[PDB]
Amino acid sequence: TTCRTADGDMLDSLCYHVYGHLLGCVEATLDANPGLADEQQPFRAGLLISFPDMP
Amino acid sequence: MIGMDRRSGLPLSGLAHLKQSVEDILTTPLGSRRMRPEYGSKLRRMVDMPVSEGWKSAVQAEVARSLGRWEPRIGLSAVRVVAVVDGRVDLLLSGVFEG
Amino acid sequence: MIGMDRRSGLPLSGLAHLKQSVEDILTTPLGSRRMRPEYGSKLRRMVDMPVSEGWKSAVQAEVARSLGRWEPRIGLSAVRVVAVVDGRVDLLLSGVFEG
Amino acid sequence: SFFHGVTVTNVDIGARTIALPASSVIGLCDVFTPGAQASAKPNVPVLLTSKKDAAAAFGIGSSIYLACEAIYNRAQAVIVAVGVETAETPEAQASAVIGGISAAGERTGLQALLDGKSRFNAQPRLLVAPGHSAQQAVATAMDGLAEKLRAIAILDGPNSTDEAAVAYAKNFGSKRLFMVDPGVQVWDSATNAARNAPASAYAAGLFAWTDAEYGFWSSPSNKEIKGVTGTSRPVEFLDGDETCRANLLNNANIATIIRDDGYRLWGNRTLSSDSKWAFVTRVRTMDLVMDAILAGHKWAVDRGITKTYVKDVTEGLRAFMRDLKNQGAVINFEVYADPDLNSASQLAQGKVYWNIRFTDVPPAENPNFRVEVTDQWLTEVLD
Amino acid sequence: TSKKDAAAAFGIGSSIYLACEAIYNRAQAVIVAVGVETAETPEAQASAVIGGISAAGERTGLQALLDGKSRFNAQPRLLVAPGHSAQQAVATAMDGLAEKLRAIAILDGPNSTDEAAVAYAKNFGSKRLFMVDPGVQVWDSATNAARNAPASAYAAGLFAWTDAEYGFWSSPSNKEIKGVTGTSRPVEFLDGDETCRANLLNNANIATIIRDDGYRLWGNRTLSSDSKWAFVTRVRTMDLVMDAILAGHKWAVDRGITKTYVKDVTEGLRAFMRDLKNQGAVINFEVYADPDLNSASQLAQGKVYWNIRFTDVPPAENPNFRVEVTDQWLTEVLD
Amino acid sequence: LAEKLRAIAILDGPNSTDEAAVAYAKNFGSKRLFMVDPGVQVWDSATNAARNAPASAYAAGLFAWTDAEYGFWSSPSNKEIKGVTGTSRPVEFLDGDETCRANLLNNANIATIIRDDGYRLWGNRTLSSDSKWAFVTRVRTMDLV
Amino acid sequence: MDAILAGHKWAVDRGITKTYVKDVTEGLRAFMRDLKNQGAVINFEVYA
Amino acid sequence: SFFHGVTVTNVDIGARTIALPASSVIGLCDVFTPGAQASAKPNVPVLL
Incomplete structure (x- = not known):
């Protein structure tokens, strides 16, 4: 379920609209994403985050 | 309860700690806090909504909600819309003092 | 209920279908329809009858009869004789609207 | 005897009903390249009601399909698109959007939007010429056109600094002009990179969405633009400061896009004196x-x-x-x-x-709050 | 009666359709247009606009507007000859025509400096003459550039618009002109200063077009003595x-x-x-x-x-305000 | 003849331009003359095409219909003409512009026929001074x- | 003095009717009444 | 017949609203060294 960010979107805001809660849902997104943490926290205009299923 | 002041770092407990928490809540939006998307108020989303009698039912709710959630040491008295000047809506918020 | 207009063939349901049925009934006589000798009104037979207080008891009945038989979607309010001008009898027929 | 028979008259003294003319028809006029894939002549209006109809009439990759894409991604409304052909100089492109009249006695550019009611029974209420409204010739010919249609012509200022955007907005002064200055930086599916959009068709996607979701009496001045992913020359509005960079533009009757990449339109003041x-x-x-x-x-x-x-x-x-x-x-x-x-x-x-x-x-553009501490209920703790 | 009707009778390239386009973009009113053929010299063009009577016994130039009521039952109330009114021969012929029609002959001065506008407006002295001096810089769709319009047909669209919007008793001296994208020789009107460059022209009974790239008519005085x-x-x-x-x-x-x-x-x-x-x-x-x-x-x-x-x-051409800080209600702070 | 019968003589002007329609109605000046200028285009059953009707008999169809439907005190100047299928030299009446071409004829005491395919009568003024x-x-x- | 000058540029050719002098003062009292409960002035008197 | 049809007019006779010109813009003028790090010219105003 890969989604594309915008240039000011942030990680905990995005996966709260997708999942509905943030307990164990942000660091699992950083886990199943290669090089996402290396990228700066204010995301670039066209990075791809693949949100995993069953948080 | 003893907290620190927002500016200048001073430890104040009763007077300005109750004021730096309420006056922050009315202008802090939802989702601005990190890992806390339910802290804040919908008052930043009440901008440019039409000023109706159903709009005041929402603002008097969202004042009672967003302060009722995260500020239990404040008893809200009255949120009365007292003036509509140039689109600016004057809402009087008289709060009680505790501690 | 959806019917067609009498002139121009247009499909109209509420407003003029309720009017093209009542205004037709008051001037259609009995026996003019084919194999339906009970459709119509006695109002064409009420011509040149003497205008008495027993005559209005018949016309307010025949309006309530001929519309009560074949037009159940119209509630009759009042059939008041309001003017006798030159033998012409002005009967006001205010009907409710349904649908 | 006047008439001898039964007379059934119809007095016809009922109060009629009044309907509203749907409030969301968008008048569009932008460049498109005519050919085999474009099913529209380069000066006639074309009624559009879906994104598939906009690509089947003007072709994918046209400058007017990219304007129809900005409207249909956010809203769902009726677009009266005109479509003009590409000129050589950019000055002569502004002569084609304004148009005027043809030698056959027919309207050519923006003037063809006056034919939107006599041909489709849909008078355009939002006059949008994206990219060309930064030129003062097109914006002042769309200003006189917005009074012929009683429409709200959504201008967009140049993508220069805020001194050149305020000095551009000091030319109009007419109540049917809505200026959205900072340019939307949107992601292009073809080149797989971020391209700059004029941020005028995206405002038309908000005037057409808020009328179908909140009513025409509700301003679109806090609603999200879903398609965008950037804003060229990004504006500043931090929390509540009356001296922000975006607030100095809303003071000068210019709408902005405030937040991170501008996912909120900001401004409900038209360019009215x-x-x-x-x-x-x-x-x-x-x-x-x-x-x-x-x-x-x-x-x-x-x-x-x-x-x-x-x-x-x-x-x-x-x-x-x-x-x-x-x-x-x-x-x-x-x-x-x-x-x-x-x-x-x-x-x-x-x-x-x-x-x-x-x-x-x-519109509640400024809910003012007056918080105060008291000592009236300080005597409450005694019993 | 319409912009589609003016192009069908004169063509797009004509200089008289550009005066109808100046009117129909701002307002929607009736235009009794005469039209003349283009003469050789600019001096002989003025004798064709003035006209007179022909050898066939027919009025030709501006005099043909006197046939505007005998043929159409629509007598002209605004007299506009755009670009030709800057000459004294045409503008004197239009003043005598404006009393025959009880009309307001809208002139336009030369596009030179303001000394050449006061010296041109000092020639007339008639109550049915309205002068708009600075030339409108408008977009030309034939050469794809900003040409200088005579700025006389654009004021005629304002007179035709306020009668349909505010009534015939309202001056157009604060309303906006639509097609204008600039003003040649821009006049000065800064804040409230009574010695601005545009106010010194209204003092000489000349209307102006004031603001940034020309979007306001300014002046409700005619050229009356x-x-x-x-x-x-x-x-x-x-x-x-x-x-x-x-x-x-x-x-x-x-x-x-x-x-x-x-x-x-x-x-x-x-x-x-x-x-x-x-x-x-x-x-x-x-x-x-x-x-x-x-x-x-x-x-x-x-x-x-x-x-x-x-x-x-x-027309309230000078709403004055008299603000003063007093101490009369200063004893109101006691209860 | 209209004064001898106390009637309303319904005229019809020429099917020429509006300069020739006003210049024809400037001869009459009497209160018992009603002029309907644009000629009705009506479908024919003989030639099987659209023929030009004088549009004066179609106006008297409305004077006879409004007296039976709405009464003799009611003007026929907004009611529909049924047999028509068009109008020679179609006049302009868009929404509310008071300088439209149909309004310039009613100002000169001439009734017109306005709408698309000419299905309305327009104008209650007679040719009176x-x-x-x-x-x-x-x-x-x-x-x- | 600079809010009145910049805020009354709509009224420079409106024509002096009875609904004009009444409705400039009605917007001029409301400017001072919204400046009085705000606390900037104490009391005022706006009149033609 | 002045106009045969329906007119819908906006009479535009209401009072207006007056806003203050923000009271807090600080005009500044002091010396500096123009160069590469300074993105201004030594006589033009710069909005800060």
């Missing part, structure tokens, strides 16, 4: 109730002024404003026949006057 | 309430002076001015049969006199 | 009482 017509809410509801009455009272042009005629126009006029009061469009109204202007000499010429006084619901 | 007929609004309403009385009383030319005739012309004249008072055109009025001029010798010749006194609505 | 007898309703009710 009179502070009465300053809000886009008051301009839009006025032009909607002045066309519902105009196009809805063509049954009463030779009826004859009887006592049941004036009363059944007024009661058919209160019933239109009372269907707007509980809907939330107005606060309260007052519809009455004018006691002074209905004189004996005005009625003898066929003139009869009605006054419709109402109050628009203003 | 009397200070009575200074405002364009007063001349426009007077020529409208005098042509309505003249054309509206052609039933009373052989009715016989009875008591129910003098009383029922006045009651038809008081009701006409009463319908102008609550419409907003006049402030108050006084219509009465003349007591002294209706003598028994004048009535026995058929002459019968009526007086119609009224006041127009003057 | 007096402002009293200008409405064709008032001349009709005065001759009936």
